[PDB]
């Protein structure tokens, strides 16, 4: 699209539609990008001496990028409730996205005075990674994606990546990709940028919670007909003398009846509890957690795979990274006290995946003969197993919405480990930068490099759609489902609102399931 | 209550805002809520036209019926009008009943 | 220049030590109304506002202090208190509590104030 | 944070004379804006809110103004109990923030 400099070059499209099957969120919001790394690619490392699994080596960009990969950039708390309160599970469908009112200004800091104004002509280029040749930054939960409430006008980030890298330092086969060799597009005012996007058939989040669970399962009114090991040895006058007799496992007997499914796997994380006092006193941050390691360095399992964070009567308790946690809106950056978070539960998977916190079974060790006790071994890692079955982490309103399959040789079950969908070519990389102006340059010739530009920022909105798809619900459940409300009682402030000075704030993170399907 | 006519679905609510416009911004990123904007307001025309419907009078009323009437005698200022400094004001509250109709 | 509403609280504090204050007041109710914020005086002369508690019980601190500074209420007693953890020497001054009519405006009433001084 | 400028720092005045300071925001404070009178060894007590609304018990001299960034009280004819250092502060957003303070000696 073009046209000219009094004209709007697009409208202002916010609503949100559902359709029974569909629904459409389209949300538009006003941005800003400044000019980065002062207009160059600067390469990028470690610190030198900084421990081994914090090395790293790559660029920064001049390269602002667009992302919106936050549940909340496109549900409103009431849409969002409307969505969760009456469907077995949803998806997205399809995408749409704009750019436009693009402005370019130009501050001048004369003196003991700056002073904004137009520079027309001067332009932003866009430009979309559609082939995904670009390091996919997007999915790695950063921060600086749409503002959760419109009004609310935000920052454009920066593109940076990283290759590999031996230490603080580069290795050979790291490559270094530039964003100008791409073909950007170039807007000036009057002009807009629009592209489409379809998703690809992924499966319906499962947005309820299990009324069954794999171990009672079965029907109690009747007694299997196989037959289980109920005792070994028996009473011979005084002593017991070994001799293996088998029951038929019915209600009393349950937990030793025959079945045909295994919980989910399992990686056992430290628990640690909401309650100070428990907590055992020093520093296992770190030395304590559950962890893997690449090429000799540790990095931590945060979201770990999918497991429920508490069996029955222990909201109190949680795994040291197998949760997801939020700040509570203004919560500084780093070693916030509890009480500035929001910590994600997991409980209702418990029903199939077993709890983060605790071992997934026990195997025996030995074998036994009558000059040898029986051994036996708790398994506190349990990789996937046949007939196992399992519920991927739950999503929450600002929780991350998709992330990309890595390019591999091999994947297995891709739902991306901190939750979401898992797209192979994922909403492509939207990626903007402010084509610089050499100011005033010098009469007599020079080949050096140009650095002395303009000082400018560009700023406009932005506007994306999106369309998702939704699986009703059908259960013949008599009594009431659980639903998410609000609470009745008085308050000093309302939930997702802004306080008296203008600050919208989120209070608490909202899940999905609530919504009650049998296994 | 307040008088007027009283309708259920009454002229929609026209509302107007000023896009904000960033005022300069920091090379290094920061998430925070964007708070320093180029000062500015807006201003224009605006038109508004409406139709009304009318019920004449009939009465065969034979003696005159009241009207609404400005004062003969000489003011200092006329009603409804700027005064010397230019202020239009309006003298009297008009209402609306003068014509006469049987009950 | 004048006002109502009482601070008390130990004079001197030792470093790395809390600092705990108490505002007791009178000819009025803590619940109820208005919302008790607590401010203080370095001795040069600016006021910094610390932070407040509300009738609801609700808190809402500045975000230089917000890591150490908690204030919490009594309603039975009509006090409110002050904690201040890791006090260091920028922390003398004196400290003030005050109401505040609230919704549209601010500090209607202040106390006395208390000097403290954190020394060795 | 809003950061408030007081003007002059200090003033000295006799009973009778008229006053005023200034007092201008980082940013629009649209009124929320107080002004506060503090006399030596005392505590802050307030004078007007809402940047013109005066508390209840002020006398009718005090008189604040303003709009936008910058905000003036004015006294408008001192009495003896008017010696004090006054302060603005702004309650528009978190959080509050007040001026540097105007000294104002009065008492020849």
């Known amino acids: 699209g073009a046209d000219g400099v009094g004209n709007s070059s697009g409208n202002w499209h916010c609503d949100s539609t559902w359709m029974g099957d569909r629904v459409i969120t389209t949300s538009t919001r006003t941005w800003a990008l400044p000019t980065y790394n002062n207009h160059l690619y600067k390469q990028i490392s470690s610190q030198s001496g900084a421990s081994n699994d914090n090395h790293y080596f790559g660029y920064s960009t001049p390269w602002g990028y667009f992302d919106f990969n936050r549940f909340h950039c496109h549900f409103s708390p009431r849409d969002w409730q409307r969505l969760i309160n009456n469907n077995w599970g949803f998806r997205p469908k399809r995408l749409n996205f704009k750019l436009f009112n693009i402005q370019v200004k130009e501050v001048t800091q004369n003196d003991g005075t700056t002073t904004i104004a137009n520079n027309l002509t001067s332009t932003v280029q866009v430009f979309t990674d559609s082939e995904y040749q670009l390091p996919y930054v997007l999915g790695s939960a950063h921060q600086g994606c749409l503002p959760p409430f419109p009004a609310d006008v935000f920052m454009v980030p920066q593109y940076g990546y990283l290759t590999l890298n031996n230490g603080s330092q580069a290795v050979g086969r790291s490559s270094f990709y530039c964003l100008e060799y791409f073909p950007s597009q170039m807007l000036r005012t009057g002009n807009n940028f629009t592209f489409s996007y379809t998703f690809e058939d992924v499966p319906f989040h499962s947005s309820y919670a299990h009324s069954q669970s794999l171990d009672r399962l079965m029907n109690p009114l009747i007694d299997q007909y196989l037959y289980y090991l109920s005792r070994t040895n028996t009473p011979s006058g005084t002593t017991t003398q070994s001799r293996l007799q088998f029951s038929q496992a019915g209600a009393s007997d349950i937990r030793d009846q025959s079945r045909n499914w295994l919980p989910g796997p399992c990686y056992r994380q430290q628990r640690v509890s909401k309650t100070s006092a428990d907590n055992n006193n020093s520093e296992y941050s770190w030395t304590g957690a559950t962890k893997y390691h690449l090429n000799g360095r540790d990095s931590l399992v945060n979201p770990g795979p999918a497991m429920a964070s508490h069996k029955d009567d222990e909201e109190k308790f949680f795994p040291q990274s197998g949760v997801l946690i939020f700040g509570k809106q203004g919560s500084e950056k780093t070693n916030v006290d509890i009480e500035k978070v929001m910590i994600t539960d997991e409980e209702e998977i418990r029903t199939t995946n077993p709890v983060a916190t605790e071992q997934y079974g026990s195997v025996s060790t030995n074998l036994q003969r009558g000059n040898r006790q029986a051994a036996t071994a708790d398994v506190n890692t349990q990789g996937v197993l046949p007939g196992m079955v399992w519920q991927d982490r739950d999503v929450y309103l600002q929780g991350p919405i998709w992330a990309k399959i890595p390019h591999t040789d091999g994947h297995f079950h891709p739902s991306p480990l901190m939750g979401g969908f898992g797209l192979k070519h994922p909403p492509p990389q939207i990626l903007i930068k402010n084509t610089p102006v050499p100011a005033n340059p010098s009469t007599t010739f020079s080949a050096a490099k140009f650095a002395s530009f303009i000082t400018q920022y560009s700023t406009g909105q932005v506007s994306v759609e999106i369309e998702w798809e939704l699986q009703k619900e059908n259960s013949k459940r008599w009594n009431p489902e659980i639903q998410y409300t609000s609470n009745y009682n008085k308050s000093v402030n309302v939930d997702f609102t802004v306080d008296t000075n203008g600050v919208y704030s989120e209070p608490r993170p909202i899940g999905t399931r609530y919504l009650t399907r049998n296994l | 209550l307040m008088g007027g006519f009283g309708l259920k679905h009454p002229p929609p609510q026209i509302l107007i805002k000023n896009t904000p416009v960033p005022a300069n911004p920091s090379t290094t990123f920061s998430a925070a809520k964007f708070a320093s904007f180029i000062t500015q307001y807006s201003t224009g025309q605006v038109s508004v036209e409406i139709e009304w419907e009318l019920q004449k009078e009939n009465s065969k009323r034979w003696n005159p019926e009241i009207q609404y009437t400005s004062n003969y005698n000489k003011s200092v200022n006329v009603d409804f009008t700027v005064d010397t400094n230019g202020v239009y004001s309006e003298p009297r509250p008009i209402g609306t009943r003068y014509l006469t109709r049987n009950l | 220049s004048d006002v109502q509403l009482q601070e008390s609280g130990p004079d001197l504090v030792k470093p790395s030590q809390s600092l705990s204050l108490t505002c007791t007041v009178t000819?009025?109710?803590?619940?109820?109304?208005?919302?008790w914020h607590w401010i203080r005086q370095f001795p040069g002369n600016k006021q910094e506002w610390m932070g407040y508690?509300?009738?609801?019980?609700?808190?809402n601190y500045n975000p230089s202090l917000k890591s150490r500074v908690s204030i919490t209420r009594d309603t039975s007693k009509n006090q409110f208190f002050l904690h201040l953890n890791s006090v260091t020497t920028e922390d003398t001054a004196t400290y003030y509590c005050?109401?505040?009519?609230?919704?549209?405006?601010?500090?209607?009433?202040w106390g006395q104030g208390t000097l403290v001084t954190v020394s060795a | 944070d809003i950061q408030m400028t007081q003007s002059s720092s200090s003033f000295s005045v006799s009973l009778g004379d008229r006053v005023t300071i200034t007092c201008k925001a980082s940013?629009?404070?649209?009124?929320?804006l107080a002004w506060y009178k503090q006399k030596p060894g005392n505590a802050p007590r307030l004078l007007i809110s809402?940047?013109?609304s005066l508390e209840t018990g002020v006398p009718s001299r005090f008189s604040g103004s303003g709009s936008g960034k910058d905000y003036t009280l004015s006294i408008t004819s001192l009495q003896n109990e008017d010696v004090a250092t006054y302060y603005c502060?702004?309650?528009?957003?978190?959080?509050?923030?007040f001026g540097s303070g105007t000294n104002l000696e009065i008492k020849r």
């Open positions: 005050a109401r505040g009519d609230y919704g549209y405006e601010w500090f209607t009433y």
């Open positions: 000819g009025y109710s803590i619940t109820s109304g208005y919302t």
């Open positions: 508690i509300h009738f609801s019980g609700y808190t």
């Open positions: 940013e629009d404070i649209h009124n929320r």
């Open positions: 809402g940047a013109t």
């Open positions: 502060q702004q309650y528009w957003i978190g959080p509050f923030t």
